[PDB]
Amino acid sequence: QDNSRYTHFLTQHYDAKPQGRDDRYCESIMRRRGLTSPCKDINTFIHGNKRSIKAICENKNGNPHRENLRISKSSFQVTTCKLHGGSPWPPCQYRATAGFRNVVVACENGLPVHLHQSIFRRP
Known about the structure:
Layout lengths: L5 H8 L9 H10 L9 E5 L4 H4 L7 E4 L3 E4 L3 E9 L8 E9 L2 E5 L2 E5 L8
């Protein structure tokens, strides 16, 4: 059962609810989702309902975007953890960046499997 890619999607881009959304939340969760040895340079988590996400995969909450990317109709609460310093080696210090924006993903068999991680950057 399940999609090992979607659960890879879930594993690193989803967190139902964070009682906190600061830098210490970022340095905690990233480490706890096996994202620190090495340190991911930038990672974004999505909060809230898990189905308002699978919906992006279909018309009810998602519109075609760029090449194969789909973009959501509803905006989402998000926490972007930007590595700090540059060394891929721990300790990995992050700076969170909470926002309210729509996510852009890639679906496979109606399930999100990829996250366009660059839209969440600061050019």
